[PDB]
Design a binder for this molecule. Structure first.
Ligand SMILES: Cc1ccc(-c2cn(-c3cccc(CP(=O)(O)O)c3)nn2)cc1
Ligand SMILES: Cc1ccc(-c2cn(-c3cccc(CP(=O)(O)O)c3)nn2)cc1
Ligand SMILES: [Zn+2]
Ligand SMILES: [Zn+2]
Length: 219
């Protein structure tokens, strides 16, 4: 069996949601995402694994006075996109990069209703920024930046002690992409990985070291 969805406040207007699922061979695994409050409204940064936990997530904030304005997925794997079907069925706007949407369609998965492209996209100007560092954990992976808090949600790109599942990874590009990410957000106060503890900007340096190391290993 699986632990309940957890929601804990991380900072002002910023929550970490952790959901869990059973994976063959691994057992129970965790996945972190964020909910960001913009005034009277809430944005999901990644959905939980399932429809059912996305609804519990959504409900928790609706019940506390926050309309769900939208939801953005950092990449196509179902630890970021599992709730997109449910959200869409509720007319809650979902966002993903054009690259993410291709990879969802290609796997027979429901796509985000809205898409964006390129390096920098404002989901909410001056409050929620999406950045594309280049291929790494997946071809499509992006990170989300909360400039008012200097909080970076890094998703499954942020891999300080081992790169994780390499099946969709781009090992030759990841050092590049990690270097760009480090240069751009070295002033982050908090960096939030998908599968490990929140840390500071040093997670950016360790991820770059890991990607280099992974690229060295493959030879
Ligand atoms: C100490 C420790 C050891 C392992 C992990 C871990 C393994 N995870 C995992 C493994 C296989 C598949 C998936 C599903 P995804 O690829 O994320 O869509 C997730 N997820 N977290 C965490 C902490
Ligand atoms: C101290 C410590 C120990 C372990 C970790 C850790 C394990 N991670 C992991 C391993 C295998 C699979 C996956 C899922 P994904 O790559 O997203 O497909 C994630 N990710 N971080 C971090 C810190
Ligand atoms: Zn992934
Ligand atoms: Zn993952």
């Amino acid at each position: 069996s699986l632990p309940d969805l957890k929601i804990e406040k991380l900072d002002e207007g910023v929550y970490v949601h952790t959901s869990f699922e059973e994976v063959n061979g691994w057992g129970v695994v965790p996945k972190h995402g964020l909910v960001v409050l913009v005034n009277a409204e809430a944005y999901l940064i990644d959905t939980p694994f399932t429809a059912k936990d996305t609804e519990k997530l959504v409900t928790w904030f609706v019940e506390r006075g926050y309309k769900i304005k939208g939801s953005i997925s950092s990449h196509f794997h179902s630890d970021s996109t599992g709730g997109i079907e449910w959200l869409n069925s509720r007319s809650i706007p979902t966002y993903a990069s054009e690259l993410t949407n291709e990879l969802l369609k290609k796997d027979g998965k429901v796509q985000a209703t809205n898409s964006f492209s390129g390096v920098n996209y404002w989901l909410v100007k001056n409050k929620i920024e999406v950045f594309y560092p280049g291929p790494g954990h997946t071809p499509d992976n992006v990170v989300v930046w909360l400039p008012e808090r200097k909080i970076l949600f890094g998703g499954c790109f942020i891999k300080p002690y081992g790169l994780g599942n390499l099946g969709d990874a781009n090992i030759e590009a990841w050092p590049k992409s990690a270097k760009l990410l480090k240069s751009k957000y070295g002033k982050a106060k908090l960096v939030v990985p998908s599968h490990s503890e929140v840390g500071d900007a040093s997670l950016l340096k360790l991820t770059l070291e890991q990607a280099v190391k992974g690229l060295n290993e493959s030879k």
